[PDB]
Amino acid sequence: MRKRPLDAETIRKLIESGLPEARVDVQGEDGVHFEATVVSPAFVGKAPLARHRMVYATLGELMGGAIHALQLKTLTPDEA
Structure with missing residues (x-):
């Protein structure tokens, strides 16, 4: 225990509260x-730029200057 709060915690918490039964892990x-795996029905069937960008924005990727080496997967809640 060094710091209660955390980066991945801020984004993860924000999404966790926003989405219903969606699971986010960063x-x-x-x-x-970094690697962030999000699971929600929003990405049902096909995940448009709306959901893709939504997660990328909420996960604050360009807010710090992360590298293109970003791993993010969008799957339905049933695949959990």
């Missing part, structure tokens, strides 16, 4: 290559 840091 591991890494801003301005760096």
Whole structure:
């Protein structure tokens, strides 16, 4: 225990509260290559730029200067 709060916690919490039964998991840091896996019905069937950008924006990727080495997967809540 060094810091109660955390980067991935801020974005994860924000989405967790926004989305209904959607699960979001982010591991890494801003301005760096991290892996964030989000699962929600919004990306049903096909995940348009709306959902893709929505997660990328809420996960604050360009807010720090992360590298293109960003791993993000959008799957339905049933695939959980």
